[PDB]
Structures are given as C-alpha cells and as structure tokens.
Design a protein around this ligand. Sequence first.
Ligand SMILES: *[C@@H]1O[C@H](CO)[C@@H](O[C@@H]2O[C@H](CO)[C@@H](O)[C@H](O)[C@H]2NC(C)=O)[C@H](O)[C@H]1NC(C)=O
Ligand SMILES: *[C@@H]1O[C@H](CO)[C@@H](O[C@@H]2O[C@H](CO)[C@@H](O)[C@H](O)[C@H]2NC(C)=O)[C@H](O)[C@H]1NC(C)=O
Ligand code: NBO
Ligand code: NAG
Ligand code: FE
Ligand code: ZN
Ligand code: ZN
Length: 341
Amino acid sequence: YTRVVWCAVGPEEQKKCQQWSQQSGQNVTCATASTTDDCIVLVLKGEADALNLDGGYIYTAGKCGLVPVLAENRKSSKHSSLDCVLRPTEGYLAVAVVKKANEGLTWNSLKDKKSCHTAVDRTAGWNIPMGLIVNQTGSCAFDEFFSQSCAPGADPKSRLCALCAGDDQGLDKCVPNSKEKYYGYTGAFRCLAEDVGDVAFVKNDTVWENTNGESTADWAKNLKREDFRLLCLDGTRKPVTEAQSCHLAVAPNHAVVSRSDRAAHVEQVLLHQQALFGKNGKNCPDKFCLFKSETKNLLFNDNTECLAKLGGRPTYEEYLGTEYVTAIANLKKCSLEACAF
Ligand SMILES: *[C@@H]1O[C@H](CO)[C@@H](O[C@@H]2O[C@H](CO)[C@@H](O)[C@H](O)[C@H]2NC(C)=O)[C@H](O)[C@H]1NC(C)=O
Ligand SMILES: *[C@@H]1O[C@H](CO)[C@@H](O[C@@H]2O[C@H](CO)[C@@H](O)[C@H](O)[C@H]2NC(C)=O)[C@H](O)[C@H]1NC(C)=O
Ligand SMILES: COc1ccc2cc(CCC(C)=O)ccc2c1
Ligand SMILES: *[C@@H]1O[C@H](CO)[C@@H](O)[C@H](O)[C@H]1NC(C)=O
Ligand SMILES: [Fe+3]
Ligand SMILES: [Zn+2]
Ligand SMILES: [Zn+2]
C-alpha cells in the first residue's frame, strides 16, 4: 500500500538497495538499471518511483516531467536554529583540481591536457566546466579540447573515454555507473590521484574526503591535500582550503526526484526511512546506514546528513536555478523544451 520502488544505478547500488529493502521490511524495494538515464526512464514508465540525482540529471528528469522531492543536505555553518530536514540547502562548490607538482597548469593552459570527469551531463563534472570551456573557446567542439579524458557516458571508442578503465575485469569501460573505476566524484578524483588525468572536475568535498586519512581506500590512503591545487577562473592556483574563493560554480544539491503523482508518497516514506537509517537514525549504524557507502557515494552521497524538505514546492527549474538551467540549455545547443525520451 505504501511501498516505494527505488532505482539503483548499476550492481553496487543494487546491492546497497537490496540491503535497504531487507532492513526496511520491503517498505522500499529495488529496480536496477545500468545508467541514470535508464533509471529516469523506469521512473517515467512507473516501474520505479524515485532516485537521487545530480543537478544535470535533474534537468533531464525535469524536462520529462519528474519533480524534485527532497534534497541532500550535508554539514553546514549558518541556518543554526534549524533541524537538518528544515535547513535550506547551500549548494556545493564545483572545482577544478590538479596536482601541485603539475606546475604551471592553470585554467588558461587546460587545452590538450588530460581530464577526469564524474560523468557526461553531471554538474561539477561536465555541465559547469564544459559550459565554461565552450563559452571561452567560442566552439562546440568540446570533444576536441582535452587530448584524452575519462567522461563516463561518452562514446567508449572516443577520446572522451580514452582514460576510463572499466571494472576489475577491464569490462564496461566508460559506463556511467560505479563499475567504471573512474566514475563519479571519487572516481574522477582517483583518475587525478593516479595521474591518469591532469585535471579532475569534482566538488570541494571530494578533495577533503579522500585525503589526509579521510579515506582508507588503497588509492587514497596516502594522499595529502597539500599535493593538490584548485584552478581558479582568473588563472591562479590555490590550496584546496580556498574553495570558497576558487571554484567554477555553486551547484544545486543532489536531490530525490519522482513522478509528480508519486512525490507526496515518496517524501513521506523517505522522511520515515531516514529517521531509521539516516545520520542519527534509530538503526544506523547497528543495522543499516542509508548515507554510508565506504566513500563510493552509492544511492546518496556519503556526506549527506539528511534529506531536506524543499521550501516553496519548487519546479525543477526553480530548484536548479534560472542561471544553471540556461547554462545547460546553452551547452546542449552543441549536441529547447522536450523530454529526451
Ligand atoms: C570543503 O569540503 C570539506 C569537506 O566537506 C569541508 O570541511 C568540512 O567542514 C565542516 C564544517 O563545515 C567540518 O566540521 C568538517 O570537519 C570538515 N571535514 C573535513 C574532512 O575536514 C569544507 O568546509 C569545505 N570548504 C568550503 C569552502 O565549503
Ligand atoms: C555561457 O554563455 C551563455 C551565453 O552568454 C550564458 O548564457 C547566458 O547567461 C546569462 C546569465 O545567467 C543570462 O542572463 C543570458 O540570458 C544567457 N544568454 C544566452 C544567450 O542564453 C551561459 O550562462 C554561459 N555558461 C556558463 C556555464 O557560464
Ligand atoms: C542547494 O541546491 C539548491 C537548491 C535550491 C536552489 C534554488 C535556487 C533558486 C534560484 C532560482 C532561479 O530559483 C537556486 C539554487 C538552488 C540550489
Ligand atoms: C514500514 O512501514 C510501516 C508504516 O507505513 C510501518 O508500520 C513499518 O514498521 C515500517 N517498517 C520499516 C522497517 O520501515
Ligand atoms: Fe553533482
Ligand atoms: Zn562563487
Ligand atoms: Zn515556485
């Protein structure tokens, strides 16, 4: 009667979803698809109810009629009187990250370097950096800017996938799910950390959560923040402590989307689910933590404190903000009002 079908992207998210499903007594169940776009289609068909999406994906989903329902909310400094669920989200900082040792690499020298992206169509990983590059370059040939990239979701035979590594068996190169070694925030940062790419397009939080012992993962356990620099738009380089003065954009927080007709029910169930499995949840960590994935950001980002209610009932365009929507629209002209499916 009140069962929510979550859409998991790839087999690792599927595994976490199944654990959530078990622990929830089948109040949540799981559909799985290979890509985020496929999950959006499942939701559109009514074969799944909801999933949590990066802003670039919210754009795709929103064009197709899906609506934002609750947003990720991480640790915050203002909005102090307020409980996390009622606290207004503050967006995250999209950054360009390089190795300090890669001296003289700036925003202005990026042409014909190697790049690491979270995925095509994602905010910090793609829409922001490529939007800026297309703009300043005056060219839609964003596929010819970097010499090689890992941009999960691009054509696997193209240079945009050249740096992608696939899964442990070396299969699924460039798939836009966590099976691709260099997928997502953590994967794109790993792509930089291992010096596969010269630059990673990620968010401020990724740099911090994967350095100075914050991650015990083999590739990350030895990383020091001091070995990294942020690329500012004015051509300068800054320590990763300076993200507030050296970022590419403020991104709208990842958020849960659903069909408008299921939004009320999805919200209700999620608010109850996080009461059980969220940050201070009754049953986390003893049984299941909804916002933990061993840094793999499965289903939700690992730094999520809670899912927050959205003031005003925003449309997807209101949630993303007019400037970001128009930035995406402008970028999409390279590849105006219609669902892609
Ligand atoms: C960039 O991201 C990092 C990681 O999320 C932020 O550092 C955290 O900030 C909170 C307070 O907001 C601290 O209580 C945590 O201890 C910090 N985490 C770590 C691992 O150090 C940092 O504030 C962000 N910088 C900006 C400018 O937003
Ligand atoms: C890239 O350039 C386009 C075109 O100038 C930008 O789109 C403009 O954005 C401003 C500020 O939000 C709007 O007031 C204009 O109406 C937009 N112009 C057009 C022609 O659509 C876009 O924001 C830029 N992209 C990025 C990522 O900065
Ligand atoms: C943290 O993620 C969010 C959440 C809601 C947002 C709402 C807006 C509204 C600004 C407009 C034009 O609606 C902008 C950016 C937003 C970013
Ligand atoms: C499932 O949902 C109902 C409320 O609709 C509740 O009675 C039941 O205990 C819930 N259990 C879990 C584990 O979420
Ligand atoms: Fe994102
Ligand atoms: Zn700013
Ligand atoms: Zn409104």
